């Protein structure tokens, strides 16, 4: 299973997977790091053009935002309770100064 991407430049993503591969090798030959089982998970990245690509599909993985969303809706908890509180206390949140934003947050 893959993920055919459009209107995205994957040539940069190819060069950061190579960097992660090097870091995995560095952590593998370290006695204090190899025993702790430290590694970075990678996925296949295959660019096909300057604005297209092909990203591998990682199984058994779900995004953090949807993970929290299912828990909150099951417990009858609104998704944006914290956001609604801030707007209730100060509707012009985006325009407050630095010191006033700390008080609301």
């Amino acid at each position: 299973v893959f993920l055919l991407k459009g209107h995205e430049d994957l040539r940069q993503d190819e060069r950061v997977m190579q960097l992660f591969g090097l870091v995995n090798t560095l952590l593998a030959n370290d006695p204090t790091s190899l025993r702790k089982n430290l590694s970075i998970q990678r996925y296949a990245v295959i660019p096909l053009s300057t604005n297209s690509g092909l990203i591998g599909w990682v199984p058994h993985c779900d995004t953090l935002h949807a993970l929290i969303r299912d828990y909150r809706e099951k417990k009858k908890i609104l998704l944006n309770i914290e956001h609604r509180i801030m707007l209730r206390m100060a509707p012009d949140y985006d325009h407050l100064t630095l010191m006033q934003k700390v008080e609301v947050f």
Partner: protein, 99 residues
């Protein structure tokens, strides 16, 4: 302060021990004529400052260019900056700083 802090100490020591290995891969990345145009927002003057900042972060001379910080102190400063309320509040709403 348990698994997280100790893991950060171990990783930073490895990266600083192998500075050249991670520098070589990054230099071939930044200095690519057809791939640095997105980071360009002389011609290669901005590329020099990007590499210098990266070298500073791997030598401790990032928070203050005057002095060199050790690994335990550098991690402590990063933790304080990452969880400070002043820095978190300025983030975009969709970023969910409150989450």
């Amino acid at each position: 302060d348990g698994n997280y802090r100790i893991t950060c100490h171990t990783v930073m020591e490895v990266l600083r021990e192998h500075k050249d290995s991670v520098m070589a891969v990054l230099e071939a990345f930044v200095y690519d004529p057809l791939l640095n145009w997105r980071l360009m927002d002389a011609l290669n003057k901005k590329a020099i400052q990007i590499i210098n900042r990266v070298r500073d972060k791997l030598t401790g001379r990032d928070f203050s260019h005057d002095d060199t910080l050790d690994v335990p102190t550098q991690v402590e400063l990063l933790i304080k900056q990452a969880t400070s309320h002043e820095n978190l509040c300025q983030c975009y709403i969709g970023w969910c700083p409150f989450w």
